[PDB]
Amino acid sequence: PATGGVKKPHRY
Amino acid sequence: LNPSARIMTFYPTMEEFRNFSRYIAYIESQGAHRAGLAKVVPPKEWKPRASYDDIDDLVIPAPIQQLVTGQSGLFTQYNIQKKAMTVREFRKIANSDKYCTPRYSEFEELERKYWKNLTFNPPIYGADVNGTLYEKHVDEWNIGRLRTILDLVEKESGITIEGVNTPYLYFGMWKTSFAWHTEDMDLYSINYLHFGEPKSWYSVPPEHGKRLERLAKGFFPGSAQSCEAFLRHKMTLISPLMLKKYGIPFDKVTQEAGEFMITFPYGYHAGFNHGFNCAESTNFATRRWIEYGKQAVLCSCRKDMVKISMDVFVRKFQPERYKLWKAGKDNTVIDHTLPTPEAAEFLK
Ligand SMILES: O=C(O)CC[C@H](O)C(=O)O
Ligand code: NI
Ligand SMILES: [Zn+2]
Numbered sequence: 321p322a323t324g325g326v327k328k329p330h331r332y
Numbered sequence: 333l334n335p336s337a338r339i340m341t342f343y344p345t346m347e348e349f350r351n352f353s354r355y356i357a358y359i360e361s362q363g364a365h366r367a368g369l370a371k372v373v374p375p376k377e378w379k380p381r382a383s384y385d386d387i388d389d390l391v392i393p394a395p396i397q398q399l400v401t402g403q404s405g406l407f408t409q410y411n412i413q414k415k416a417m418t419v420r421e422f423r424k425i426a427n428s429d430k431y432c433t434p435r436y437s438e439f440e441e442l443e444r445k446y447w448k449n450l451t452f453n454p455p456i457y458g459a460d461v462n463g464t465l466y467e468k469h470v471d472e473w474n475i476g477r478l479r480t481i482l483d484l485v486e487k488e489s490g491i492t493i494e495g496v497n498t499p500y501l502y503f504g505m506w507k508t509s510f511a512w513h514t515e516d517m518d519l520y521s522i523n524y525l526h527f528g529e530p531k532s533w534y535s536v537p538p539e540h541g542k543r544l545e546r547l548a549k550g551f552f553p554g555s556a557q558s559c560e561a562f563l564r565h566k567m568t569l570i571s572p573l574m575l576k577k578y579g580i581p582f583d584k585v586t587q588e589a590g591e592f593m594i595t596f597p598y599g600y601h602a603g604f605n606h607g608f609n610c611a612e613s614t615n616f617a618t619r620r621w622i623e624y625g626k627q628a629v630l631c632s633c634r635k636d637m638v639k640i641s642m643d644v645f646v647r648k649f650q651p652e653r654y655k656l657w658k659a660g661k662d663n664t665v666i667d668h669t670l671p672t673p674e675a676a677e678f679l680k
Contacts, residue, residue, distance in 0.1 A: 322641040327495025328460035331413040
């Protein structure tokens with residue numbers, strides 16, 4: 321989709 | 333307005349503190365946005381919460397141990413997720429002798445110790461925790477609901493981008509850090525230090541942001557080759573000594589409990605916490621942001637990265653440029669000096 325995701329960066 | 337482009341601090345009255353977007357327009361008409369970062373001390377009468385003693389059971393689902401590898405002022409941070417824990421348990425470890433703030437006299441000293449031991453004794457950071465410590469009764473500068481044109485994303489597409497259009501909590505401890513970056517979609521951001529030890533910031537004037545990106549690109553060739561916007565990975569740390577050495581203009585400021593910090597579009601910043609504390613943050617926008625949002629360089633080497641369709645904003649606030657924009661023929665060039673249009677009220 322065109323809008324979305326989340327600020328929290330990918331964590332190891 | 334602020335030729336020095338130095339970080340500015342403001343002291344609004346309760347009457348000025350009530351209209352959020354209007355005050356932002358005011359400080360921008362004073363050149364606050366030039367430094368890419370500004371501090372706003374709220375009126376003494378203002379309090380977002382009555383007391384912060386009723387949160388010891390608050391859960392920090394995904395704490396991260398911050399491992400750092402590097403040398404000569406250039407570092408890369410790897411955030412290792414640890415088992416969930418409550419604020420109570422985090423507070424105990426944060427204040428423990430092994431992770432507690434070192435002894436010092438002046439900030440310059442603590443700053444030196446930070447850059448000296450940042451790769452040693454990896455700290456834990458209760459970062460990106462969904463939630464707010466604001467009492468649902470407060471209507472002034474409420475991070476959970478600022479009412480800026482950014483709401484168009486939720487109110488129109490029914491999409492919620494956590495941390496961007498929703499509040500995030502950050503529980504830090506000595507040496508915990510946030511790497512160099514600009515907000516997603518180069519939006520604004522608001523940071524309030526609820527309580528605890530301070531948080532120091534480093535900021536690069538937006539009008540000089542490109543030369544920081546080029547310096548970063550140079551230092552990390554591989555990362556750049558794999559992703560033009562690798563800095564959005566939020567894993568890059570760069571010391572002020574390195575910045576000065578390569579001629580990158582910048583300034584520093586220390587935020588205290590009870591103070592607000594505002595970052596502006598394309599404003600690069602990074603920093604660290606002096607000790608146990610808690611901050612609430614979220615993004616927001618103004619009419620001036622739209623252009624930055626349209627030209628924002630994005631990261632696509634990863635999934636789940638924040639992506640916002642600029643269609644609703646261009647169509648609404650730039651109807652006479654929409655057709656050319658959709659056609660990919662919009663050649664607008666941004667002037668980082670200009671304040672948001674809403675500031676014309678304070679220009680006369
Ligand atoms: O305080 C942190 O850990 C990150 C704060 C964020 O960079 C902001 O712009 O509010
Ligand atoms: Ni930020
Ligand atoms: Zn990427």
